[PDB]
From Swiss-Prot:
This is YTH domain-containing protein 1. Changing residue 129 to K: Does not affect ability to influence alternative splice site selection. The chain holds residues 345 to 507 of 727 of the full protein. Changing residue 128 to A: Reduced binding affinity for N6-methyladenosine (m6A)-containing RNAs by 100-fold. It comes from Homo sapiens. RNA binds at residues 18-20, 34-35, 83, 129.
Amino acid sequence: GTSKLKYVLQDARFFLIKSNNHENVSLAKAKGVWSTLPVNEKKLNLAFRSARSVILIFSVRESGKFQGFARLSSESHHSPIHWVLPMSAKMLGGVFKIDWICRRELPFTKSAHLTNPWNEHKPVKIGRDGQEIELECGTQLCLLFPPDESIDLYQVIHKM
Ligand SMILES: CNC(=O)c1ccc2[nH]c(C)c(C)c2c1
């Protein structure tokens, strides 16, 4: 069903995360963590205190797809992570813990009807790493992903 998913997304905030390689998204999926540059780290920490759920929607650059979405379970904090960088390791910030809500892909062709008011109404696939996605656009984007039957949102609801 979709009822628990809709509950988790209620009054949520949404951020587009752009990764330059698949390896970092796979590590995030395996370990339940993300790290970003300080300008985005500060924004995500502010958002985490501001909203019931903060949702990161991941896209690997040049893939033409989103790779899934996840909810922040903590602010950033400073084991290490063997990220693959394009940079010099210590240019990144702290580590955010995340709970995956969907690990399945969604092609950009399926989100062509979604525009983001916070990025000049460009298609939601367009945005810098860290671009906030307005509530209605972000909710509809998350609802487009294929259902991920491996995930149980019961534990995620209790963290709200
Ligand atoms: C120009 N931005 C970057 O190179 C960049 C930004 C955010 C990032 N998060 C992680 C895990 C990496 C490797 C990374 C690189």
